[PDB]
Design a protein around this ligand. Structure first.
Ligand SMILES: Cc1ncc(C[n+]2csc(CCOP(=O)(O)O)c2C)c(N)n1
Ligand SMILES: [Mg+2]
Length: 226
């Protein structure tokens, strides 16, 4: 994953979304970079650096943590995505950026980042369509199941929006998010998603490596079987 000179293809985008681990320092009681390393070794296919709120790091300390997480992703051969912070993404030469409905407007972010990967969180059909017309490479849909990791979430929607987007014939890359565990991931893939994303199911696991590996095995099975 080098410096891109073309938009990512939908085929490659959908492969990367399979097991999409998201983490910051306030999401684990263990050493944060160690947790990221273990998730990548077990099989996460994409990583998002999300360091915000709670007792998150700030300043130089947050930047130095991001550089260590990015180096972990380079050693594993997995792309590094930054949540929210367009300037950090550009300064680190991240592989991409994830934004939501209250963040910078997708059209302006797509202008600022060239051919980097762009993800948008969406909760409704118009928001998916808008994200696609704005130049997103994928959408994050949810919350599928109840979750407390992110404070301010929208209402729990199950797989309803995923099915509705596939019914309207839209083929954009989709990752499901919100309260996903190894026990409830399969239906997200059966409804038509290209992957699952998680924080707690991996970051707070007794054994994050084995948790990542089990997700990778299960998601592969269900993508072939739907
Ligand atoms: C790919 C992507 N889609 C959406 C979001 C926003 N988001 C929605 S629910 C949630 C918490 C999940 O934690 P848990 O797995 O512990 O329930 C997050 C961070 C994002 N940052 N990235
Ligand atoms: Mg955001």
């Amino acid at each position: 994953h080098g410096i891109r000179m073309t938009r990512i293809s939908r085929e490659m985008m959908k492969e990367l979304l399979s097991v999409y681990f998201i983490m910051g320092s306030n999401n684990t009681k263990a050493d944060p970079v160690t947790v990221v390393q273990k998730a990548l070794k077990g099989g996460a296919t994409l990583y998002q650096f999300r360091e915000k709120g709670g007792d998150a790091l700030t300043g130089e300390a947050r930047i130095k943590f991001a550089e260590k997480a990015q180096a972990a992703c380079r050693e594993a051969g997995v792309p590094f995505i930054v949540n929210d912070d367009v300037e950090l993404a550009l300064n680190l030469k991240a592989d991409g950026i994830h934004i939501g409905q209250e963040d910078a407007n997708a059209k302006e972010v797509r202008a600022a980042i060239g051919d980097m990967i762009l993800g948008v969180s969406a909760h409704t059909m118009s928001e998916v369509k808008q994200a696609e017309e704005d130049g997103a490479d994928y959408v994050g849909l949810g919350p599928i199941y109840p979750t407390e990791t992110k404070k301010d979430t929208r209402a729990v929607q199950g797989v309803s929006l995923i099915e509705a987007v596939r019914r309207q014939g839209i083929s954009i890359p989709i990752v499901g998010i919100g309260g996903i565990t190894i026990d409830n991931a399969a239906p997200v893939i059966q409804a038509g998603a290209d992957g699952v994303s998680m924080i707690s199911a991996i970051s707070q696991a007794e054994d994050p490596e084995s948790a990542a590996r089990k997700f990778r095995e299960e998601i592969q099975t269900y993508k072939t079987g739907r």
